[PDB]
Design a protein around this ligand. Structure first.
Ligand SMILES: O=C(O)c1cc(-c2ccc(F)cc2F)ccc1O
Ligand SMILES: [Zn+2]
Lengths: 331, 331
């Protein structure tokens, strides 16, 4: 019974240039002190997010994992690195460099630090090419943002990407990014509190109600972050609309709630009643412990909510380790 | 045990000429078909939306209330009537006209049909004086939309309006409308399944995280539709951000979940487990039966989810009737 944290992020140790050989204004880089504990992600010479040392330092992170009791942590790019709005070839070179950084990071201890890759998702060919390349090099899967502008997961290019990954047994973690709401949610981190769970819910519903799950091979292993946003709580309203409105059944021939056997979520819902509902909707085999480490909006005592819950011990063990080791092929 | 449905809408018998008194191009009017069972909302000469008889005909609505077992229904404007983007004086005159149409609609059976008023929310002084005028004239409260373009409920103008209504014991219903993310949600009722719960959550959180609930007198009676949207499920994630980031705390001087004593929600969450969670979060005193009627009835039952639940019979009575009688002052 290891403990696997399958939701965490890292940021590479990349110079101001290097980073400017791709873009001054938009390719991010890492500015670090001599004090060492402190650093910032820089865009050009702007700032952006001060960052904790465990975001970039694998040795420092291993100490934190020991204190938290985490045996293995899956980690992957922070969304600022995605580069989805870039010229496709530049973005594919970026992705390759980023995925090499990730393996370098995990090389500090590959038995305990696993990595997921990013892909140049705005170009299907380059995206599939990089997915297979990165997995052949030791990534256990791919992490993508959930949409490309107005194209959600039901978009043909995105469905085709999931189908490539399914056909090569490449697991997918879907992360919300580029949040809806435009000019509205500008204070108190409302984007993270409102738009992000809606982004994830939209991604799941897009796959379900478009019939995408009818087209995508059952072999796809896909997991959505942050418990799947509000998906589980709003499922009853979805199922009701499907039963009583033929326009909700136009492309989806089964009740939406039956498609929970096609994806996974992590457990980061931050509430005991929420977790129980979530497990009740997804089943104990489809929730995996994830923490959003090392970000402040993550779970501070990793696995605290699952271990202190009232679920059976078989359930707890699946969530903290059994499911993710099967999902990602970890021993 | 008067079964009360406190969440429903209507649209009046507005002729083209009546609407041309305000805006020949943008004031909506109702073109009832010659057969009388369907109609169109119109703007000028253009067809805007097809509508069903129950929307405009109070006598037919009584028929459906009887079939459904609803003894009293609270109704108020459908959002196309709001007029928030209009010049302020025109919008105030329109609001008074609409609020008169509502009283005329309720006059068909005022024991069983109660109404709430609309206000020209784009002008503080005009909005509060119409609020007082309409409540004196017989309205039991106000229904506002949840946002005015990019201005959410934390906007000073809107906070001030709620304070006015708190101070005069004018209850308030918040109806989500003009949904975010529209260019992405054009099939399968996604605006109502995804954007609408988010809109409601955003409205609750904008009052909390801005500290508006701290400055708004506790006398305010305010209710959010559709169970509060995803608010109750995502509250843990909100608390775990308030704990851990200063900027989530800058204007909210207590943990967000402590404000669940400051508002109400209707019971529309379409799922027993989701309802239990909702009552667990809000308490049996702050959930009110509300259906968003008119909708095609079919096999569905207003209040069926609540009555068939496992809550205390005492709790059901509060949800079915007790809470709305106290909230709106009905006997
Ligand atoms: O505490 C914060 O400010 C915070 C920040 C992030 C975050 C940081 C950097 C980045 F490129 C993207 C992010 F979502 C993610 C979560 C979070 O809580
Ligand atoms: Zn994350």
């Amino acid at each position: 019974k290891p403990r696997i944290d399958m939701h965490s992020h890292f940021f590479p140790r990349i110079s101001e240039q290097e980073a400017a050989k791709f873009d001054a204004n938009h390719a991010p880089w890492l500015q670090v002190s001599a004090k060492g504990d402190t650093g910032s992600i820089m865009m050009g010479k702007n700032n952006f997010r001060p960052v904790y040392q465990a975001l970039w330092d694998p040795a420092f992170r291993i100490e934190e994992m020991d204190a938290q009791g985490v045996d293995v942590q899956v980690t992957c790019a922070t969304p600022v690195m995605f580069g989805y709005t870039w010229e496709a070839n530049k973005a594919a070179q970026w992705a390759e460099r980023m995925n090499d950084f990730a393996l370098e990071f995990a090389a500090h201890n590959p038995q305990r630090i696993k990595v997921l890759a990013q892909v140049p998702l705005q170009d299907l060919d380059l995206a599939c090419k990089e997915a297979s390349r990165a997995v052949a090099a030791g990534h256990l899967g791919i992490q993508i943002g959930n949409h490309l502008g107005d194209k959600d997961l039901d978009d043909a290019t995105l469905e085709a990407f999931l189908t490539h990954c399914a056909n090569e047994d490449i697991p997918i973690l879907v992360h919300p990014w580029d949040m809806m709401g435009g000019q509205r949610m500008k204070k108190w981190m409302l984007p993270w509190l409102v738009a992000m769970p809606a982004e994830t819910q939209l991604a799941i519903l897009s796959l379900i109600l478009s019939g995408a799950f009818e087209r995508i091979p059952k072999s796809l292993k896909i997991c959505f972050g942050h418990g799947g946003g509000s998906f589980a709580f709003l499922l009853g309203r979805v199922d009701n609309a499907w039963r009583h409105r033929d326009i909700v059944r136009e492309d989806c021939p089964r009740p939406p709630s039956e498609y929970v056997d096609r994806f996974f979520v992590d457990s980061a819902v931050f509430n005991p009643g929420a977790l129980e509902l979530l497990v009740s909707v997804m089943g104990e085999d489809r929730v995996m412990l994830g923490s959003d480490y090392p970000f402040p909006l993550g779970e501070q005592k990793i696995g605290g909510l699952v271990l202190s819950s009232n679920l059976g011990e078989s359930a707890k063990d699946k969530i903290i380790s059994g499911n993710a080791s099967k999902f990602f092929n970890i021993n």
